Structures are given as structure tokens and as C-alpha cells.
Amino acid sequence: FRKMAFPSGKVEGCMVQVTCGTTTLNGLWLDDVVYCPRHVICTSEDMLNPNYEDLLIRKSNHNFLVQAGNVQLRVIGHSMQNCVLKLKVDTANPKTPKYKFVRIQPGQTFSVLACYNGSPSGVYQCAMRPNFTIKGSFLNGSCGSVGFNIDYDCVSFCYMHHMELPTGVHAGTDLEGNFYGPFVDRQTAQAAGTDTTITVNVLAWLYAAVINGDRWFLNFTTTLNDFNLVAMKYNYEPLTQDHVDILGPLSAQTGIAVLDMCASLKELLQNGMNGRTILGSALLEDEFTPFDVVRQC
Amino acid sequence: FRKMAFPSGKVEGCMVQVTCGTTTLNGLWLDDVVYCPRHVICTSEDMLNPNYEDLLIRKSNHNFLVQAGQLRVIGHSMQNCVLKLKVDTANPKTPKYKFVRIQPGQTFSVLACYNGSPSGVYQCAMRPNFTIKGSFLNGSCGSVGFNIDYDCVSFCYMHHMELPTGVHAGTDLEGNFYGPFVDRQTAQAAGTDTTITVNVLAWLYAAVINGDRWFLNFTTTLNDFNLVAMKYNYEPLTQDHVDILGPLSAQTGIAVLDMCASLKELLQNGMNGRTILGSALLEDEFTPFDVVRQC
Ligand SMILES: *[C@@H](O)[C@H](C[C@@H]1CC=NC1=O)NC(=O)[C@H](CC(C)C)NC(=O)OC(C)(C)C1CCC(F)(F)CC1
Ligand SMILES: *[C@@H](O)[C@H](C[C@@H]1CC=NC1=O)NC(=O)[C@H](CC(C)C)NC(=O)OC(C)(C)C1CCC(F)(F)CC1
Structure with missing residues (x-):
């Protein structure tokens, strides 16, 4: 929600x-x-x-x-x-949490603690886009701000902020200093790829919508190969069976078969939202993982 | 943004x-x-x-x-x-704090908790009809909303209940409900909601600040715009609103009444499938203060 x-x-x-x-x-x-x-x-x-x-x-x-x-x-x-x-x-941080450094995969999400002058200003949720940018909110002085997930008591640091890119999206490294994506830390124009929509996240969000009583978009069915014919057209990530299975918990909680949800998605991609809205958005949201949705439901 | x-x-x-x-x-x-x-x-x-x-x-x-x-x-x-x-124990981790009762249209952060443990944080607005569009499951009651002013936490909301439309209601930290609601498990009407016009303008300033200017067009008057807001269940715009937007008006060089002009057109013609700051709707849960803080 x-x-x-x-x-x-x-x-x-x-x-x-x-x-x-x-x-x-x-x-x-x-x-x-x-x-x-x-x-x-x-x-x-x-x-x-x-x-x-x-x-x-x-x-x-x-x-x-x-x-x-x-x-x-x-x-x-x-x-x-x-x-x-x-x-x-010379001083070890007395406030050091349990932590690991991890290199996240495109399509995964994380929280950003946006900071200036070493002082936290705000926190928000981001996704690592398929082209290895993030769509953040960063001003001058925000570099060194970090992205993280929390697994129980353990903080997994996954991002450090370095730069902005020509479309206003952002690029950064893991905590070992390796950039996500093809970028380099020099102040020159740099191409981020064509981005794509994270299909499995869009499905997770339609399940989230169903879970919350928003069901107008539901309909027909389709095949995995036939959906990807349509996903490819609209620059959607292709859907695998690994994705189908990652959506299993939501499929089960709702009683809606993934491929049925795909059918409705083809309908929304093909037809649009005719002015209707889903969970208060007028577009298809792709920065909630299946994990995120479960966490929030 | x-x-x-x-x-x-x-x-x-x-x-x-x-x-x-x-x-x-x-x-x-x-x-x-x-x-x-x-x-x-x-x-x-x-x-x-x-x-x-x-x-x-x-x-x-x-x-x-x-x-x-x-x-x-x-x-x-x-x-x-x-x-x-x-x-019998004072909380050793007690921050500097005050209890405040916020006004409709203002925003605040919610720390959503279950069994006394934080699960997440997110930004909310107090709607004109004194509800909030939150994310709360069973067990979330007693979760609080707040603002931070320097070192000082201003607690403004505690969560009590859901309402029939899926929106949420709760109290200030003195236990007084925002709005007409009571803590009994019966269906309760929230009023007609209305759109927080000053916040929509602030967000159009945010968009212009971030390079997104396609919607800029004409001018209007305060009485003329409000004739169109009333139609669309927008809060009417006042001069106090105009003045609250001053820093944004100043930072962009766009007269509030000109922004009102563009906004009337969006309200009249819709967004023709375009987007503003990546949204296909007009966003009304960023205050002028909020937009400033983020720019
Ligand atoms: C933290 O030091 C800043 C944060 C930037 C500043 C504006 N938005 C942000 O997210 N990082 C930088 O200023 C980097 C530092 C270099 C050593 C990589 N420089 C930077 O991002 O410059 C600009 C904003 C001009 C961009 C440079 C790359 C680009 F040409 F592709 C787009 C512009
Ligand atoms: C914290 O105890 C919960 C959190 C609620 C439950 C699910 N979403 C939430 O935000 N509060 C309640 O369970 C309240 C407690 C009463 C003493 C007020 N009850 C409640 O919200 O019941 C439901 C969810 C059935 C709603 C009751 C009011 C309504 F009829 F208007 C809509 C349904």
C-alpha cells in the first residue's frame, strides 16, 4: 500500500x-x-x-x-x-550494528538514509533498476549516503552514493567501491542503458492491490511465452518460472494464478488504465519486490 | 524527488x-x-x-x-x-520531545510497529477530513507519527483504527481523536475528502525545480482559480497560502497565480497521459515546507 x-x-x-x-x-x-x-x-x-x-x-x-x-x-x-x-x-564505533556488505541484484530494493555533513536528513525506499541506476533524491553533499536492508538485527549495506547521471537518476557503488553498472566517478556525461520495467515487481504490486481490495483490473488467461511476447514489446523484463515461484506466497495468499495475473497485466499494458487507478497510482509500480509486499502484508 | x-x-x-x-x-x-x-x-x-x-x-x-x-x-x-x-524506570533513550496537534494538510512520518518492534517508516499527511492514508495491519495500534525539529521529536499521531474506505484514524498524544471518530468497532463516516491545493502547488514547484516544466502555460485571479477548485473539491487558496509558497515562488521566478493558471488547465484538461515528477496524478501530500527541505 x-x-x-x-x-x-x-x-x-x-x-x-x-x-x-x-x-x-x-x-x-x-x-x-x-x-x-x-x-x-x-x-x-x-x-x-x-x-x-x-x-x-x-x-x-x-x-x-x-x-x-x-x-x-x-x-x-x-x-x-x-x-x-x-x-x-583509532576509535571503534561504539554504535556499530551487526552488519554485512552485499552486492545487490537489479530489481531488488533497499532503503536510503540520505545524509548531509554526516547528519541524517531523511529515509526512503529505492530499487536498483535493471540498468543499474537508482531513482533517488540526492543533492550536493549527499555522497557517502548509504543504502541498506535490515535482516533481523543485521544491517546489510548495499549502496554508497557517488554521482548523478544525465537523466537525473543516480549511480553509486557497493561498500567495496565497485560501481553498480558501467559508470565511473568522473564528472563527464555517461550513458545509462535503456531501462526496463521489473515485471516480477509489477506482479507483486498487483497482488498487493488484490490483497487490499482493489480488484477491477482482474479478468482471460495466458501463457508464459505469450506474455513475454507482450512484455518484450513494452520493455518489460521477461518473466521466468523462478519469478513465478518467487510470487508463490502471494499467489497462495490470494488464490490467483500468476499466469492469470499476467493476463490482466497484458490487458493493462495493451489497453491502459482507462483513467482507473491501482492502489492510488495511475501507473504500474515496479519498485516493490514480492518480498517487500509480503513484509507489508 | x-x-x-x-x-x-x-x-x-x-x-x-x-x-x-x-x-x-x-x-x-x-x-x-x-x-x-x-x-x-x-x-x-x-x-x-x-x-x-x-x-x-x-x-x-x-x-x-x-x-x-x-x-x-x-x-x-x-x-x-x-x-x-x-x-518505575525512566526511558534512558528519551529524546527531546513535545506533543503537538497537527493541522489538516500537514505531514508527518509514521514508524509502523508490531509487538513493540519497528518494521518500517513512511510519510503521511493529515487529510482535510482528518484521516490518514497509512499502511497498518492488526497489531499496529500505538504506532506513532512525528516530525523532527533539529534535536526535538514532535509527536503528533497515535494509531487506533481503520475506517470503511481503508483509510486510518487515530489521536494526538493526549488521546483526542483527529476528526469525528470514536474508538469503537463500528462503521463510521469520514467526510468527503478534498485535495490540499497548497500542497499540489508546492509539488508543481518541486517539479519545475527538477526540470519538469511541460505543464507551464496564461494567468488567473485568486477568486477565479477558487471557482475552479471548488468544482474539483480542492481546498480554496488564500493569500496565507500564497505567502507560504513564497520561498518556492522566489526560487523559481513563477508567480503563484501563474502556477494556479497551469493547475486549472491540468484540472480542466487532465494530464493527457503525461507525467509530473514521475506521477500520473497530482500529488498533494508534500507541504511547501517539505518541498523546501528536499531542495
Ligand atoms: C556527492 O559528491 C555528489 C552528489 C551529486 C551532486 C548532484 N546530485 C548528486 O547526486 N557527487 C558528485 O557531484 C559527482 C562527483 C564526481 C567525482 C563523480 N559529480 C556529479 O555527479 O556531477 C554532475 C551532477 C554534474 C553529473 C556528472 C555526471 C553526468 F555528466 F553524467 C551528469 C551530471
Ligand atoms: C490496532 O489495534 C488496530 C489496527 C486496525 C486494524 C486493521 N487495520 C487497522 O488500522 N485497531 C483496531 O482493530 C480497531 C480497534 C477499535 C477499538 C477501534 N478496530 C478496527 O479498526 O476494526 C475494523 C478494522 C474492523 C474497522 C472498524 C471501524 C470501521 F467500521 F469503520 C471500519 C472497520
Whole structure:
């Protein structure tokens, strides 16, 4: 029904401010390590085509100001891992949650704790698009903001924010500094692919709508091969049987066979929503996973 | 640009589980007081027409099991539709906080909880008819809505019930319902809803700020626009509204009355299948304040 993020408290306690010269952004303080985007070591001129190895060589440990609230932390070591800087500090974060680093798959979702100057401003739910962008809400100073999921007590960090792209969507790395998608951290125009709609998520959302009593779109049936003929037309991800089975819990809770739901989806793709709306939206929503829907129902 | 909630850390530390008999729900633990919906004292039978005073008479402090991940209850009072449980431990995680009663059209974040444990956070608006379009399942009552002002949490909503259209109703933290609703499990009319016009304008400013300008067209008057809003169940626009949009008007160079012009056209002609900030409808749950904060 509602786009819902994870509670952010466990991550709020990890956010610090990282300054190198005049550039400032957010870092993530876990145990005795602060993780931040490596372009914090860039001046405005550097950003256009930086030689990061050369730039960092000129920096020493004491050129990195790490503030945790009103408390400067002391930097005792520094390495570059892909597109992230790792700063070793003398203090281990007393607020370090149980955590892992994971590299998510396109079509999965996650929560973003948007931060400025090391201070949380807001939290919202995002999806990793098939073209490995995210459609975020990020201003200058938001780099180093992180995306995460919470599995019980354990925070899985999956995204760190680095840049905007020409269509206004966003690109970033995993917490090992490897970009999602073909992007590089230099301030040049870069092509994000044709995006596609995450078909399995759209189905999860139609189940969510059914679960909530919104049933007008239901109808006919179809075949998996026949639906994908139509999905391909509309730039939908093709549906696999793995997808069918991932939708199993929702299929079961509703008594609606996936392929029947597909039939109605072909109808909506082919005919449109004739002005009607589904769960208060006038378009087909594809940033709720089957998992998300189960969580919220 | 998208729907952004406040960080929920300060509130997560206040959520407890309150059990009375078989019924369990969420309470809010601040200083030495736990606040929760008074229908925690109801059995399944009671809920059709409870006499809360009589029902509570029969409860003693030790019938209230409070658990923060057990707190000892030393006193209990009913204030309007909320129960106040006095406990012997003050919450060490109590943030700076106030209780406020929000106005319709204002927004707030909801920390949705089950069994005293946070599950998610999301942004809501108090509708003109004093409902909210939330996401609440059984067990979510006592979940709270709030705003954060610097270091200070302003609690404004506690969740009590669903209404026949699937929208939700609840109280301020003094237990006074927003709107005409009562905490009994009977069908209850929410008024006709209306669209929060100032919020729609704020979001059109948000769209223009983010490069989305196709809808910009003409001008109008305040009385002329309102003639069209009234038709479309939009709140009428006032000059206080015009002035509240000042920072946005200023940041874009677009006169509010010009934005009103474009908005009337969208209301008259629809969006011809186009979208604005990725939505195919006019969004009315971002305040001018909200749009500012996000830009
Ligand atoms: C955090 O340092 C910022 C956050 C950006 C700023 C505006 N929106 C955001 O999400 N990151 C950057 O400013 C990056 C830093 C480089 C070292 C990669 N630069 C950046 O995103 O520049 C702009 C906004 C000009 C974009 C550059 C890539 C593009 F040409 F494809 C589109 C514009
Ligand atoms: C927290 O205890 C729940 C949360 C509700 C239940 C499902 N969605 C929600 O938001 N509150 C209730 O169960 C209330 C408790 C009463 C003492 C007021 N009862 C309730 O909401 O009952 C239902 C869901 C049947 C509605 C009753 C009012 C209505 F008739 F107008 C619509 C149905």
C-alpha cells in the first residue's frame, strides 16, 4: 500500500562527516574503519578527469578530518579500494550494528538514509533498476549516503552514493567501491542503458492491490511465452518460472494464478488504465519486490 | 524527488510492547510514562461498544505487562482515548520531545510497529477530513507519527483504527481523536475528502525545480482559480497560502497565480497521459515546507 523504508536508527549511528581540504561528504563508520567515496580527495578542477592514485599519494592521514557529531576522530591509516576510501581510525564505533556488505541484484530494493555533513536528513525506499541506476533524491553533499536492508538485527549495506547521471537518476557503488553498472566517478556525461520495467515487481504490486481490495483490473488467461511476447514489446523484463515461484506466497495468499495475473497485466499494458487507478497510482509500480509486499502484508 | 520520511532512530528507542490480557499493542515510552491506545484493555467482545471507564475499573497495574525488548507498572490513568502507564524506570533513550496537534494538510512520518518492534517508516499527511492514508495491519495500534525539529521529536499521531474506505484514524498524544471518530468497532463516516491545493502547488514547484516544466502555460485571479477548485473539491487558496509558497515562488521566478493558471488547465484538461515528477496524478501530500527541505 505505502512505499516503506526500514527503520534507520542502526545506520544513523554509523554516519560521520569526512573532510579532505574543502570537500566534505558523508562517511560510514563501522568498527575502526570509515568508508567514503574516494572523490572526497578531489578539488573542483580534479573532478573532470581525476587520476585518483596520484591525487591520494599527495594526501596523508592527517589531511582527513573525520567528525562524529562534535567529536573529531583521529585517522591512523588509509587505503583506496576501488572507488571507496577506507580510513582507519583509532576509535571503534561504539554504535556499530551487526552488519554485512552485499552486492545487490537489479530489481531488488533497499532503503536510503540520505545524509548531509554526516547528519541524517531523511529515509526512503529505492530499487536498483535493471540498468543499474537508482531513482533517488540526492543533492550536493549527499555522497557517502548509504543504502541498506535490515535482516533481523543485521544491517546489510548495499549502496554508497557517488554521482548523478544525465537523466537525473543516480549511480553509486557497493561498500567495496565497485560501481553498480558501467559508470565511473568522473564528472563527464555517461550513458545509462535503456531501462526496463521489473515485471516480477509489477506482479507483486498487483497482488498487493488484490490483497487490499482493489480488484477491477482482474479478468482471460495466458501463457508464459505469450506474455513475454507482450512484455518484450513494452520493455518489460521477461518473466521466468523462478519469478513465478518467487510470487508463490502471494499467489497462495490470494488464490490467483500468476499466469492469470499476467493476463490482466497484458490487458493493462495493451489497453491502459482507462483513467482507473491501482492502489492510488495511475501507473504500474515496479519498485516493490514480492518480498517487500509480503513484509507489508 | 520522492516521498521522504524523517530518520526514525530517536523514536525506535521509545517503542515498547504493551499487553493486557490477550491483547497486545505498541506503546510509547517517554520519561517514566508509557502511552498507548486504551483499547488494549478490550477483549474481542468489548470492541463493538466498550464502556472504557467500567472496563478499566477492573484492571490493576499488574494486569499491564510492558516490555522493552519487562518494565514494572506503578500507576495507570486514562486520558481521553489513551492509557498512561506510570512505570518505575525512566526511558534512558528519551529524546527531546513535545506533543503537538497537527493541522489538516500537514505531514508527518509514521514508524509502523508490531509487538513493540519497528518494521518500517513512511510519510503521511493529515487529510482535510482528518484521516490518514497509512499502511497498518492488526497489531499496529500505538504506532506513532512525528516530525523532527533539529534535536526535538514532535509527536503528533497515535494509531487506533481503520475506517470503511481503508483509510486510518487515530489521536494526538493526549488521546483526542483527529476528526469525528470514536474508538469503537463500528462503521463510521469520514467526510468527503478534498485535495490540499497548497500542497499540489508546492509539488508543481518541486517539479519545475527538477526540470519538469511541460505543464507551464496564461494567468488567473485568486477568486477565479477558487471557482475552479471548488468544482474539483480542492481546498480554496488564500493569500496565507500564497505567502507560504513564497520561498518556492522566489526560487523559481513563477508567480503563484501563474502556477494556479497551469493547475486549472491540468484540472480542466487532465494530464493527457503525461507525467509530473514521475506521477500520473497530482500529488498533494508534500507541504511547501517539505518541498523546501528536499531542495
Ligand atoms: C556527492 O559528491 C555528489 C552528489 C551529486 C551532486 C548532484 N546530485 C548528486 O547526486 N557527487 C558528485 O557531484 C559527482 C562527483 C564526481 C567525482 C563523480 N559529480 C556529479 O555527479 O556531477 C554532475 C551532477 C554534474 C553529473 C556528472 C555526471 C553526468 F555528466 F553524467 C551528469 C551530471
Ligand atoms: C490496532 O489495534 C488496530 C489496527 C486496525 C486494524 C486493521 N487495520 C487497522 O488500522 N485497531 C483496531 O482493530 C480497531 C480497534 C477499535 C477499538 C477501534 N478496530 C478496527 O479498526 O476494526 C475494523 C478494522 C474492523 C474497522 C472498524 C471501524 C470501521 F467500521 F469503520 C471500519 C472497520
